[PDB]
Amino acid sequence: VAPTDELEQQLAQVWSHVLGIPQMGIDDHFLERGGDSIKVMQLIHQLKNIGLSLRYDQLFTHPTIRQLKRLLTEQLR
Numbered sequence: 001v002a003p004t005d006e007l008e009q010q011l012a013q014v015w016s017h018v019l020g021i022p023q024m025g026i027d028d029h030f031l032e033r034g035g036d037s038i039k040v041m042q043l044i045h046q047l048k049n050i051g052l053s054l055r056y057d058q059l060f061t062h063p064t065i066r067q068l069k070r071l072l073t074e075q076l077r
Contacts (some may be wrong), residue, residue: 001027002025002026003026003065004071007069008065008069011065011069012025012065015030015043015065018035018042018045018046019033019034019035019039020034021033021034023027024065026065026066026069027065027066029063030063031063034053036062041068043059045049052074052076054068055073058071
């Protein structure tokens with residue numbers, strides 16, 4: 001439930017901010033914590049402000065932080 005790297009913690013924090021609820025786990029489902037389309041916009045907006053971007057449909061196919069973490073193709077040997 002707890003984040004591992006400092007990036008996953010930062011991602012959990014922005015998540016907590018958008019949803020108005022602290023300490024977001026990486027297995028909590030985004031659509032199970034009150035996420036609307038307007039809240040998705042706040043995430044996308046606040047992500048362009050700090051970090052990279054994100055598309056609307058990419059959130060539903062990666063509706064967890066673990067899946068969004070794996071979706072790093074946007075940015076083990």
